Design an enzyme around this catalytic site. Structure first.
Site, short mmCIF file in Angstrom:
data_model
loop_
_atom_site.label_atom_id
_atom_site.label_comp_id
_atom_site.label_asym_id
_atom_site.label_seq_id
_atom_site.Cartn_x
_atom_site.Cartn_y
_atom_site.Cartn_z
CD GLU A 174 43.07 -8.19 -17.24
OE1 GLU A 174 44.03 -8.55 -16.73
OE2 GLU A 174 42.27 -9.26 -17.67
CG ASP A 182 40.81 -8.96 -0.27
OD1 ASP A 182 40.34 -8.63 0.68
OD2 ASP A 182 40.18 -9.30 -1.27
CG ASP A 223 37.15 -12.29 4.11
OD1 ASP A 223 36.14 -11.49 4.66
OD2 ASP A 223 36.76 -12.97 3.47
CB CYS A 248 29.35 -6.01 15.27
SG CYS A 248 30.40 -6.58 16.39
N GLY A 276 33.97 -2.83 1.14
CA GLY A 276 32.48 -2.46 0.96
C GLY A 276 31.57 -3.27 1.75
CB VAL A 283 40.41 -3.08 4.56
CG1 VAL A 283 41.16 -1.72 4.27
CG2 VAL A 283 39.42 -2.30 5.46
ZN ZN Z 1 31.25 -8.41 15.31
#
Ligand code: ZN
EC number: 2.7.7.102
Lengths: 372, 213
Positions: A41, A106, A108, A125, A158, A162
């Site tokens: 899919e 995933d 974040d 950063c 992006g 990661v």
């Molecule tokens: Zn930072």
């Protein structure tokens, strides 16, 4: 980068830059099993945020066509079903079920918002990115050592973090319960906001933790005490005091006030803690709470999850979902990531090259395992 | 043995395979009643004492001797095997009965296994043993190498050592494993039995078994 230049860049990118060759090698898995790629899919997001899923294709060429034809803004990868997603209208209810899928993670930065000082919200950063770095070493080590997984692909999201794709044969067939069990095995940061101390350790430390600590030790000083400076002031070090018994708040409060930098203060904490043991692992609980990875279980729990496709384009940053070298992870820099605007320039004259090589190196070892 | 009953047509151990045998309705019906009392005895002891106590170990051993459960222990083996597959027909009718039948049969295996020799358990190195000693003590005699997936409840709580995709479990903890996978196969078989029943349900010869549950 200008997101209005985007729809034009895609046409060119999808037509002369996207590595369809290596891409097909992956999802078909040497064609050893029939209809494997064909039952996969996908889902596309077009202009004006129009979403569609249950999209499937016959082969590499069939893919290359509809993609540059459709020109999607978002591409997510789903599971392997019993049939063709684009034929789901023929299959009766109860027979259309997800059967196999790679194991995914995933990670974040948004989940660390309570323990970073450098940035906020979606801003990032180099000083915080070490979190993602440590998380990979912690996780990639466990999957390889504890789980014996040999084929592990990590990919930049992006922007905010990661992804990881595990494609071992035995892995793709794993049940949802097993997937959930490993999340629990890897998860230490438990709590929302009502809970200030999200980590509690027994006297006896499970090796997975021990090994993960020894990784964090190598990064802690420069990240936590220097780049972040989590003991810069009282506003900052009180948050730490929330993670320890009340019986030592005053004692440490003084030593912090008598101290000059975070390194001295962290050293004090260790001595007080070490002395407190003799009279538990307060040092490690703190390092972990600040550096150990946080995991949203939902992404890896469900077999039917649509996750952003590698080499996809972030509609805002323009950055590419590029492969990463585990061997050169510490040297990785998400800001040096090629933008779509940058490589389209190179084609009409790419910087995408070195990253594709890594993906092929992954494919090569994948064949050998499949063979021998 | 005037009355007869076809099991094959009708259909310590996990009670996996059905018995292919012809038996008397009197053996059939009596054998059911026999095992029922047993399970009800387990339920009373489970409430009364605590499993592990010698009294519990002594009392259940007695009732088992009483209810008849080498070739010396073969006659009970046939009794225990067949008796179980009959009760499957009784206690599959409802979740409460399934749970009840399961829970008692669960508690049963524990005891049957509590009184089992270590040698036979394996059937149903020394350098590598001492080499991974520390790594396991910190994590959580004989230890067995299982694919981690089959040890879900263990490694999902960090109560065992993992390495290269395989768990390393003690004999103390491996109990709940076999106990639970069994719980699944049984609750699965019951679920199946619950499908099989409404064709034979109306049979008068089965009336006393389906009512006096
Ligand atoms: Zn930072």
């Amino acid at each position: 980068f200008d997101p209005t230049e985007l729809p034009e860049l895609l046409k060119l990118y999808y037509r002369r830059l996207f590595p369809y060759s290596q891409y097909y090698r992956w999802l078909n898995y040497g064609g050893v099993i029939k209809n494997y790629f064909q039952h996969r899919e996908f889902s596309f997001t077009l202009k004006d945020d129009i979403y569609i899923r249950y999209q499937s294709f016959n082969n590499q060429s069939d893919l290359e066509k509809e993609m540059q034809a459709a020109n999607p803004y978002k591409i997510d990868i789903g599971a392997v079903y019993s049939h063709r997603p684009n034929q789901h209208n023929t299959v009766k209810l109860g027979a259309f079920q997800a059967q196999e899928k790679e194991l995914v993670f995933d990670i974040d930065m948004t989940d660390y918002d309570d323990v970073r000082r450098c940035c906020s919200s979606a801003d990032i950063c180099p000083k915080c990115w070490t979190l993602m770095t440590m998380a990979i070493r912690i996780i990639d080590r466990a999957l390889k050592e504890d789980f014996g997984f040999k084929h592990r692909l990590w990919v930049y999201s992006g922007r905010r973090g990661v992804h990881c794709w595990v494609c071992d044969e035995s892995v793709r067939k794993l049940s949802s319960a097993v997937r959930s069990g490993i999340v629990e095995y890897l998860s230490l940061v438990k709590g929302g906001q009502d809970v200030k101390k999200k980590v509690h350790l027994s006297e006896k430390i499970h090796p997975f933790i021990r090994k993960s600590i020894n990784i964090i030790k190598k990064y802690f000083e420069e990240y936590a005490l220097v780049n972040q400076d989590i003991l810069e002031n009282k506003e900052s070090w009180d948050k730490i005091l929330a993670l320890v018994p009340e019986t030592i708040h005053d004692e440490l409060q003084q030593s912090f006030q008598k101290s000059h930098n975070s390194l001295q203060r962290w050293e004090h904490l260790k001595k007080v803690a070490s002395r407190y043991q003799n009279n538990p692992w307060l040092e490690w609980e703190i390092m972990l709470q600040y550096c150990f990875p946080r995991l949203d279980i939902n992404v890896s729990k469900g077999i039917n999850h649509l996750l952003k496709s590698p080499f996809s384009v972030h509609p805002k940053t323009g950055r590419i979902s590029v492969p990463i070298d585990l061997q050169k992870v510490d040297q990785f820099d998400p800001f040096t990531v090629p933008t779509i605007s940058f490589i389209c320039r190179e084609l009409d004259a790419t910087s995408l090259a070195p990253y594709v090589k890594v993906f092929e190196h992954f494919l090569e070892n994948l064949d050998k395992s499949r063979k021998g | 043995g005037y009355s007869e009953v076809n099991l094959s047509k009708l259909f310590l151990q996990f009670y996996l395979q059905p018995p292919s045998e012809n038996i008397s309705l009197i053996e059939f019906e009596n054998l059911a009643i026999d095992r029922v009392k047993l399970l009800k005895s387990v339920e009373n002891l489970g409430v009364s004492y605590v499993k592990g106590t010698e009294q519990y170990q002594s009392k259940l051993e007695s009732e088992l001797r009483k209810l008849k459960f080498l070739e010396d222990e073969y006659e009970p083996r046939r009794r225990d095997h067949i008796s179980h597959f009959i009760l499957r027909l009784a206690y599959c009718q409802s979740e409460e009965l399934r749970r009840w039948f399961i829970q008692q049969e669960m508690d049963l295996l524990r005891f049957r296994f509590s009184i089992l020799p270590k040698d036979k358990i394996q059937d149903f190195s020394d350098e590598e043993k001492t080499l991974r000693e520390q790594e396991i003590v910190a994590s959580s005699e004989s230890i067995y190498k299982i694919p981690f997936a089959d040890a879900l409840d263990l490694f999902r709580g960090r109560k065992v050592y993992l390495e290269d995709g395989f768990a390393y479990v003690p004999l103390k903890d491996i109990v709940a494993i076999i106990l639970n996978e069994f719980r699944a196969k049984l609750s699965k078989a019951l679920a199946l039995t619950a499908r099989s029943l409404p064709a034979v349900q109306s049979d008068e010869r089965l009336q006393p078994l389906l009512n006096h549950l």
